[PDB]
Amino acid sequence: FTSDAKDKPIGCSVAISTYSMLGHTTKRSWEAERVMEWLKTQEWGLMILDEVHTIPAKMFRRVLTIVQAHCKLGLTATLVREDDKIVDLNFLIGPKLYEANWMELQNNGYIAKVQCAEVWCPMSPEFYREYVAIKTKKRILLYTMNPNKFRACQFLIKFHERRNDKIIVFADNVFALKEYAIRLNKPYIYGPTSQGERMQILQNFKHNPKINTIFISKVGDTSFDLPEANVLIQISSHGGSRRQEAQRLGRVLRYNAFFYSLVSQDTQEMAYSTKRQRFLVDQGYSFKVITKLAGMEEEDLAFSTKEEQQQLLQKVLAAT
Amino acid sequence: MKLNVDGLLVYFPYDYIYPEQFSYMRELKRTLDAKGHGVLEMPSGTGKTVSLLALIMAYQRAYPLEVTKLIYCSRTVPEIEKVIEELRKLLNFYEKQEGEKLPFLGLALSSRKNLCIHPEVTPLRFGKDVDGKCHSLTASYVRAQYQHDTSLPHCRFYEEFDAHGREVPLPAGIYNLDDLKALGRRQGWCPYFLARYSILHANVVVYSYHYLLDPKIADLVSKELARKAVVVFDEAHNIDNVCIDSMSVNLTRRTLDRCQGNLETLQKTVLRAEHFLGFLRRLLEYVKWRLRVQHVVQESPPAFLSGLAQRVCIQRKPLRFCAERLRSLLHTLEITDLADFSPLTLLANFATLVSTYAKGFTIIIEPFDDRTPTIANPILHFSCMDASLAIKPVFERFQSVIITSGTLSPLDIYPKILDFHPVTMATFTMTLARVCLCPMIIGRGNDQVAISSKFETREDIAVIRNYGNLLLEMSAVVPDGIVAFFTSYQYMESTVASWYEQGILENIQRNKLLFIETQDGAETSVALEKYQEACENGRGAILLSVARGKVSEGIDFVHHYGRAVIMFGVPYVYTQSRILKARLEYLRDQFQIRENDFLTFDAMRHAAQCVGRAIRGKTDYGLMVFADKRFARGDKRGKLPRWIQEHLTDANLNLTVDEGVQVAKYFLRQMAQPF
Amino acid sequence: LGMMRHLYVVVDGSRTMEDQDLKPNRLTCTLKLLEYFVEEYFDQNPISQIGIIVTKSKRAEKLTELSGNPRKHITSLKKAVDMTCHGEPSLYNSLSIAMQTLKHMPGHTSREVLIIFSSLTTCDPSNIYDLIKTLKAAKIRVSVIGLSAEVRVCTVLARETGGTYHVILDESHYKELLTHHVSPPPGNTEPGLTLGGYFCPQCRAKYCELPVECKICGLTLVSAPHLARSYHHLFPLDAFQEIRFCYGCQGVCAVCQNVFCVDCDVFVHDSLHCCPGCIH
DNA sequence: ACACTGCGAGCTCGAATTC
DNA sequence: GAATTCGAGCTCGCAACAATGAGCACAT
Ligand code: SF4
Ligand SMILES: [Zn+2]
């Protein structure tokens, strides 16, 4: 029931639809109107609500009054969510039945042994000159487009391309997605790309031993078909979303595999990156700290001189 | 194994059935109790044949008054013998389970050249030759002096048949064609006239299409056999092409110049009736006058019969009995062979078809030779447009008639062309323990160039290289046999001889041998026996052929022969022939079928027939690429049937050449491993 | 328990050995696990042999002759990393070279060929199906490990001669396939025990620190402790019935009637393989 | 007496944070 | 409490669609 296929949805046994289609509060199309008139009058059994942690939103909880079901199963992976509405979910669906022990599944082989490592990078002395001078949201670019964080991304990509590892660089703040992925000549699912080249960049990543990295931006924050990565160099994501860094971790466990978390130290991202490990240390995961990488200065890394570093600050500060 | 469908006790000859195969017997019982037709699509060749026979043969035991006889029209003589061997396996299972004998006989019918004992006539190669020399010994004037029983030529078996073969019938024991010759050998009877006599008292009867849908045959053999029967048209994709060619004749300059010799020999024998020879001499010089013109193509299906009464003054009331009196004239003339008058019977069959059948017909006279500006070669086609004019006896006479194949591509086209209304019109999909097929649509080339075989996109070497770069990179990752169907023969020549001038055909012969399937049957069977030898020893081969060919319909590519099947374009017919350009003008007014929705329907039933040849069995796996850009469109990949469409995902829909290899290289590695 | 074995290892050297989907060189990842395979073969099988044949450009060239030398094989696989590997392989020329020597071995052994095979095509100048009637007559046991696909010959060569055909999932499956080819399937030779450093008694020839055969007089020289580990499988010790002060550690046998504790009981059957009271 | 399928606009949400 | 940033899915207008080849079974 997803507005493109509509495999005669009137009169079936299993209907696989989405949120915001059953709760679309505008004037619906005519093909969706005759299905919703059929779906509002049949008593179901076992509604399966995938990604339960978005149900206590204002528009996604009106689905449970439109559709009449006897029992309602809810399957999720990251039950934590901000704004304190997970306790509100105890009467929309019911009591929490089973939570899997995230370390018992690792010791038995059902989940890859993840070696979390919060490698943090120092701040450049030219960038910290303007970081403490402004407060109104322009410094989010400054702790994201750090030149000393650009080296630790380029070094960790090189260090795992020589081990034949499938690299995913999750990176929000889409201006710095472009300026990271064109200075390393790597593909990027920018997010407003298409439905077409989103499907072939993702397929050139799996069944091809030449294309090795990929620069997603806020797309893989759900149960998408990201094809079994091996490392995950997460750079400068959303603020304190401990739901996010348990969904970025979901790509890795699908040491064996290990994901990083690039932090520009002595900035506001240091306080953020301990809010997001607050859920993962309650499952058993241990976040190491890599203050200095294993020989970063010896290879051919970008932004060596200060002349090429002065041009990057004039590109960042020109946005405003 | 006592298997219970909705009301019946079906005795299945196996142990494990497939979960879809129970619904095939369930949906076929839904036709027989409703006494109506049915268009069922069912993928496999065997398994479908033994589940259709397990139900209907068990249906006539519980309701022996509603159905009495099962007619099973198969394509040709190999599948005629295959169905009967699937019936002994069901009968002998019933012999073990019940321990008794039955009044149950099943036959098989074919031509006189498949049921023949007489030694002077059996090694005759052509089928029209054995019909004459039999008629030289079995005609009613040859037996006229055999009431004296002299030493004058005859058939030993035919005179021994009608003296003893009418009193006692065949008791039991399902007969092949070889069993009917063996029964005819040790008894001394004719096999052909014993099978045609006992076809009225049987329970399963397996012959070809042309005993039932051919109008000048079906009134002689299947006239008074059964009014409450069950007809099954097995492997019935090209019912439309069979009912057209059965009511379409072709006349040219070579045929009509031979009819003047037949009228010459008929003039020497009358002096040794006379109005009928002047009748035919009048008609022959009119059709020669109509082919005498060198002008534009023209069509006039009832107006031919008006101008035939102007210059010649011959009406349609004596013209309707033209082919009847010519059959009567050769009987009273006592001629030896009748294959020599085959041009004159073709003119007599043409004369009785213009007179009676003119609703959806045409006469297309083409003085313009194909592809050449001015070459003297005229031909008139009497082409039938309406494919429902040869089943109107069959859809009416019998009780329930079922049209079953494996690749009925839209199920709502076949009740639109053929004027009938089914009661089920169902489709099915085979169950699998793996993904036994990996269909992909390899679209754009390796340098993002479109790959399609249009008519303008054939000369440029940016596409011929991208076909050669595909067959090269699939011949290194596919084991033991690749079948590459091209769209035509002049495109197979102009691509293979343009791969050779580049450095592409040199690198394909390093991996696999390549065996071109040519038009003549002598080189083809040589190149096919070496192909199946090369797939069995180490090297592997490539049988590159033509989609509208002999190998595409007859030869079945079982496992490790043709692991991959490569379609080098959408196999369209010539879409500018004046016959096809006139049939589509009849399919637009009648039935309101769009002109473009029929050319793609015709192409997606020949591109899904030969691709579906790669998988026949339990453990058979097989790659099937579709190497054209136009296959990705919604009105083309939505046609090809639901058992090869439920594995064609959206990722394998515009794959490039190098990306299509790593889907294939991962698929064959996964299939190579045990269950 | 097991028998003697004369294993050959046929290694593919085609154009397709330059392929990816493995550690840097497909050829290199083959030769990496083969050096692991020669070590574990000679450890569990003391007096067996290994030949290594490499097929390349429609011809087979013998890399190492058939000898029980667990050093000469690994020092030759390190050399063959820089091989050219051009052309299409053969399978008639490689199994016949592995038949001119392996046929004349005595019949008390288990003569075997193991083909590691990456190419899909065996361009060979004769019929392969007469070898499979010949190799089945000579009681050879040909088993193939296939790469990336399943070929019809390698199924009928395996199931008629008696071996196995297997296709690789990945490198963790490729090590699992070579690990299953070290266990022997269920006469009197004359070896020479090499006491005094490493010298040969029969010809008194001094050479290197090896369990290898002697070239000067043809005798095989084994070391008796290496033969000694294969004992205790035959006539092993029967278990005890168990219902303080011990006899093993001094802090019940049905033979010597001396009690044990629990640590001692598990230790006798696991590692010591003899009863400490029974040796007295 | 012209016109199929992809593909970007608005529209309205959610998640988490500034303002 | 009212914005932002960047994502989502659902409607729905918009612009323009296409279609080239070759032969044996069956009745007196
Ligand atoms: S009459 Fe009988 S024997 Fe004679 S040609 Fe016909 S089938 Fe053969
Ligand atoms: Zn010696």
Ligand SMILES: [Zn+2]
């Ligand atoms: Zn003891």
Ligand SMILES: [Zn+2]
């Ligand atoms: Zn003790």
